[PDB]
Paper text:
Alpha-hydroxy acids are oxidized by a family of FMN-dependent enzymes. These enzymes use molecular oxygen to convert their substrate to product with the liberation of H2O2 as a by-product. PaLCTO is annotated as lactate oxidase and its closest homolog in [name] proteome does not use lactate as a substrate. We describe here structural and biophysical studies of PaLCTO, which revealed FMN-dependent folding and oligomerization of the enzyme.
In order to study whether monomeric enzyme could incorporate the co-factor, we incubated it with FMN and subsequently carried out SEC analysis to see if the protein oligomerizes in the presence of the co-factor. The protein indeed eluted at the same elution volume as native tetrameric protein indicating co-factor dependent oligomerization. Refolded protein had similar spectra to WT native PaLCTO and melting temperature (47 ± 1°C). The structure was solved to 2.60 Å resolution. The structure proved that PaLCTO gains the same three-dimensional structure as WT PaLCTO when refolded. We also saw signs of two conformations for the chain S201 –A219 in the structure of refolded PaLCTO, but due to modest resolution and lack of electron density the chains could not be built. SAXS analysis of refolded PaLCTO were also in line and indicated that the protein had a molecular weight of 151 kDa, Kratky plot was similar to native PaLCTO and Dmax was 113 Å as for the native tetramer.
Numbering used by the authors:
A (entry chain A), B (entry chain A), C (entry chain A), D (entry chain A): 2 to 203, 213 to 369
Amino acid sequence: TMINGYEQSDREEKIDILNLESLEKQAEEIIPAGGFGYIAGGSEDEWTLKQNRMAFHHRQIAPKALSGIEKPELNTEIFGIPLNTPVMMAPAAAQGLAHSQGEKDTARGLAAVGGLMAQSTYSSVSIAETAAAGGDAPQFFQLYMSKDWNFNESLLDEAKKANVKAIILTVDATVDGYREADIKNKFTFPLPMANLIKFSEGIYASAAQNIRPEDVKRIADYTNLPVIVKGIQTPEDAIRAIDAGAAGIYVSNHGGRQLNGGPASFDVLEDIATAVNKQVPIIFDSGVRRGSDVFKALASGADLVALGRPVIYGLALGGAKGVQSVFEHLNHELEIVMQLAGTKTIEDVKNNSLLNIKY
Amino acid sequence: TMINGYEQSDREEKIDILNLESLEKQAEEIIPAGGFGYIAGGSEDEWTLKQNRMAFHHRQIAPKALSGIEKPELNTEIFGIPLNTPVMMAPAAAQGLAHSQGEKDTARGLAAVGGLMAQSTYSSVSIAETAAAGGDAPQFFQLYMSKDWNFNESLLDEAKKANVKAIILTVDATVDGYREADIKNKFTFPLPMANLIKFSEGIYASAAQNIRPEDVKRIADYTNLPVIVKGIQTPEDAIRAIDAGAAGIYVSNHGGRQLNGGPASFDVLEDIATAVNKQVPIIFDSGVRRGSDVFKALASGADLVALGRPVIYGLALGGAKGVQSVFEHLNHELEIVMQLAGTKTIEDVKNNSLLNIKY
Amino acid sequence: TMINGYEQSDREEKIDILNLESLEKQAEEIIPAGGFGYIAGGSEDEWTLKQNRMAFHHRQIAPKALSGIEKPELNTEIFGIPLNTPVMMAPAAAQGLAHSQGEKDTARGLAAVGGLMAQSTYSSVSIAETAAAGGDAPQFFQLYMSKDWNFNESLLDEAKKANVKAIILTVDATVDGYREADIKNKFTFPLPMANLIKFSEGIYASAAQNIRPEDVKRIADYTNLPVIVKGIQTPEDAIRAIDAGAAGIYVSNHGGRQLNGGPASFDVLEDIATAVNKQVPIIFDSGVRRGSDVFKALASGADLVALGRPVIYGLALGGAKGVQSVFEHLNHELEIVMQLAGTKTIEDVKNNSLLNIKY
Amino acid sequence: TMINGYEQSDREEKIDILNLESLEKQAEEIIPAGGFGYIAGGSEDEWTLKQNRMAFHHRQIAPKALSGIEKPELNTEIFGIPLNTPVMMAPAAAQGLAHSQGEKDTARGLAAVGGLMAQSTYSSVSIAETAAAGGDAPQFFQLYMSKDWNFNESLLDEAKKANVKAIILTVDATVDGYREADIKNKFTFPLPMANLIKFSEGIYASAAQNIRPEDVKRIADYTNLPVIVKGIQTPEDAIRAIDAGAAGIYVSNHGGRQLNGGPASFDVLEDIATAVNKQVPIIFDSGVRRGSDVFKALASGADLVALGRPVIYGLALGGAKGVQSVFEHLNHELEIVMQLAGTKTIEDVKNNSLLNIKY
Ligand SMILES: Cc1cc2nc3c(=O)[nH]c(=O)nc-3n(C[C@H](O)[C@H](O)[C@H](O)COP(=O)(O)O)c2cc1C
Ligand SMILES: Cc1cc2nc3c(=O)[nH]c(=O)nc-3n(C[C@H](O)[C@H](O)[C@H](O)COP(=O)(O)O)c2cc1C
Ligand SMILES: Cc1cc2nc3c(=O)[nH]c(=O)nc-3n(C[C@H](O)[C@H](O)[C@H](O)COP(=O)(O)O)c2cc1C
Ligand SMILES: Cc1cc2nc3c(=O)[nH]c(=O)nc-3n(C[C@H](O)[C@H](O)[C@H](O)COP(=O)(O)O)c2cc1C
């Protein structure tokens, strides 16, 4: 399939996954060079991108002897919504760069593993189509605010009509990071932005760079849904968001694509969780690839753990069944760790105390 | 020699050893690719495998000036049993992957250097044959528990009949780690499991994933032998094992094959030893390759130091005499360190205070 | 253009800059080998050169959520002089090695972005020509003291006549560092030193190796301009300079060209700033290449941030417009960071608290 | 020149030295493979060899602003003996491996720069010839003790007759380290041991492995010379040596050739110096190659700084004039650092306070 001379994947098949990191070298044979650069890249020298991986080495999981547990269970809840896994899809623009079906194959994959999907404002496919593809699989919607509230109120209405269970407000992207891969490729989006086209019938730069605490109160009061602030990297900011009416905190550095020279996401998670003190659920992302990565995030104060790039690569390699493969593989790796660590349930993982030796 | 199309080594000869690490590149020319992958591999990205080596850099041995010692002695005891060396063979499944004689050549090698051998439940050769090959060389037996106690009680009987002096209960392998090399090779064991075949006349997944402290009391009461819990990586768990009736603690992370993202074995040894406070002997393994590695383990709270992979490589390269070469080489390296450090006996090494500079 | 068989650049054009580090590999295709070695090199094994880059990893910038700022402003002042950017040109000898126009194209570049230029005593072009090229763009003059005060007083007079707004006294170069690249190239300056030729009508070794605190008082009293001591790497020395009559402190290790085995410039900045306690403005250089580098310097106690090598490379690649490109690129990168960090103005960046996690 | 089929260097010429590290790659083109391996090698995996270099990164030299010093002076004294440099020749066996003249060209080199030479028991050339070649240049003699005191007393007599000013007792080599290069090369010394041949007319294994504190008292009482214990790596051992009658402490790990897994020599220097509290002079070696290395050793508690390998390489490349070149080059690098650091004399370097940032 082509769209303005860009080759999109049409694959639909389970994929043999060695691990999630190795999906990147595999996806690069099939995703056009400019789109691939767009997905894999981070900002400046990609130091924060690299540290997002390294930082998991900063804590260690104790093997547990004589636990008396078998057959660990991945099931959990958020805002009373049941999930089969604590692993979820992070909001990710322009999945049409990977596959002709784009976000619809993502939604089907997530529905297949009973996991949570976050839709992006900057989707290749509209809110209604993506929610329709997912059936009754729970979805969140991620809003990029306009200076224009007529636009904000229209997308929130479309989201409410689609039965989304929460709004993610993304606040760490008021401007694009300096992304060298997009500059080298002279990359321009070859396909359209469904939700923007639709507003237009009744990029980062109408968006709003100026975002205040009153804007969280306002979205909460309009939607009457739980609102989650995404991009938090400090305790003070988690407190400030809860004070303004947030129902959750999404600890993220946008996969190292924004403020390069900021810390690895993992390294600020426990501090934020200590400040939040279980007042609201916490979602965590940026650098998650192995079962041990997920275990450590849950043990450090996360309730849910989101991936971005590994899923987009799986979407290119296998469409809906590709996405499914990604979540099944990470679930497998996480089950192994939970057994060896003596954590029966996801609540046991959160109560687990990590070692802090310096390597 | 062949067995279901798998080439086994028939070599029997002393081997020139530069060092134990270099045995891996040498063994790979002769062990079939899938078996080699099975032996060399660790779990996930093998970070814990790598750290098992690195962690020895975390403490340093003081050269001692004017010690007034010569001709250091490697002799020691466990449970009143005399050994010529504190270096022992860790329990290791399926030595038939390296050599037609498998565990029998291992047993002969260990008998030749007056060292202790641990037999594995998942041996290529039965308990009785392995004990027969070793003559009067002391051996331990390593049990993988079944949900079925009729099976546990049969292997413990076979072990008692073979004059084993202790039981090792291995508790860190209730499920296989995620081992990428076995997945890449599509590796299936080409040869049988002697002790299982024998039960069947009157893999990790009858075994028992649920292991409790009462199961240590039970094995001790049945066998009336000392029981050693293997896979301990925390002080709390060493205490919990002693409380349940363990006669020893085997500090091990299974050579980095299980819970990847757990600490290097060496890094938790001194803490465990401080908690144990010489109430019971301690065995230590995972990453041991040089004389200084052994010295540091003994100085940090070990009574015995076990190897796995370096011996299996030596078995492939030289059978019984190959195994012997491995233990003679490590003994040489350890004698040098003991002389330069001013430790006359193995008890002097345990009383040695290591430096803790950060490199 | 040639001068004693040395090829000089004549280019005049905007340059596409991926980033400032990548200018070095680009400049090397066009600057003759010996001149290139002179510019890129540091002293001994260049460990201090390398650490000047690494040390920026020692602190991290917090992304700020819900800042309520847009359109950050780069404007600032020193000694009441308005600048469009806190990024300035460090004093740098012999720009004729890069371009036929030398320091004149530098001056024009800096005037184009409304930034501050420091002239060097060891210029290819005289004080008067360089100041003439810059028009009304503010410039400082960097003095290398002679044992002969008749020479000092002549250059300070030439500087005063050119309307320079301050004197930089450089005290970290009483002897050349051991620079291996100059030894390998057998490098001899192929072009003359304008300000020295001019004195001679009415290298490091008349200069003065013995520099005292009375020499700062003396230059201040003669010129009646603010005097800034450059090369400070300790709090005690910043205090000693202020005590002797310095109006500013220039934290610098001369781009790792002098005392190899001394600390990275960044690593002593906050200590010096704590001791100085805003008594005088602070200029910072050595290893600055990205927006995050500049943000971190300002946040750690700098008022201005100077570059050397990246500008010289830009001068070779594009003359006046090349230099301009360098400052526009670093300004862009700095604007992005300021937006994501929630710092509206340059005073907000100085009030920003950096994270101190260990990587 | 040949000796039992081994090619020896006959060169006599000043050598162009980029730096001391680069002498190793240059010497390897001319020294036969087995001899080269003997000189360059360390023990086990050479980790301690590597750290001897790395550890100099653990402290940093402050550039000093406004010092008011010029023309730094390298002159010093030990036991009232004047030297032109604090850089000295460490005792080094078998210099005949590098050059037909062996230790005689070393002695002439050291006499040319007014530096101190240590002779080795295991010299290619006798005590009397080496002392004769050096003229009135001060020399020390390094004793390897025999179980036989008739041998000890004969070499000490030969040393006293040669006007040596002190005895070094080397105590860190009671057995050879495990040196892999000598094992790979099947290396056997192709030339004789002059001082042993001479005893025989009226390797490490008659020597004495058992060395006590009474043996220091005994050598001091017999020779009536100052006795220096070499190989000290702990404060306790420096105290124990002073208690037994040592007149100096030689902090050394034998260039990383002995106890691999022991600390870098530099890392224990300040502790030893704090314990010694200037009761006796301290000599320091193992990993010294740059001016900054020497400055840091002096600043950390050394009185003299010895080299081994860099001199042996220089002896191969240029004989007497080669050795001279090595000491002149390191003197140059040290003069530069002393000027930039504001240390006029060698006593000023010892009073210098190093920075301790972690890199
Ligand atoms: C190609 C791509 C598009 C993205 N689009 C969005 C987006 O529209 N909204 C958003 O809030 N975050 C976006 N992100 C950030 C992700 O939500 C998430 O924080 C990140 O991808 C997690 O890091 P990982 O890719 O290493 O797992 C995007 C990330 C990628 C790689
Ligand atoms: C090929 C192989 C088979 C093993 N089989 C067993 C086993 O059957 N039982 C057990 O308790 N440990 C087993 N182990 C773990 C070892 O007992 C030991 O902890 C490990 O090999 C030590 O690390 P090293 O190989 O670096 O020395 C095995 C290890 C290897 C490499
Ligand atoms: C080629 C070159 C010439 C220099 N000339 C001078 C000079 O004449 N006076 C001076 O005070 N500093 C001089 N410096 C040091 C710079 O002022 C500045 O401290 C340094 O270049 C900053 O490090 P950077 O090049 O990594 O940004 C020079 C540096 C270079 C690379
Ligand atoms: C080839 C060689 C021979 C040596 N011979 C002796 C010796 O006979 N006696 C001794 O006390 N130390 C000996 N050493 C150790 C040196 O005295 C010194 O501690 C070491 O070479 C310093 O480290 P460096 O080579 O990195 O500078 C020798 C070292 C080398 C490399």
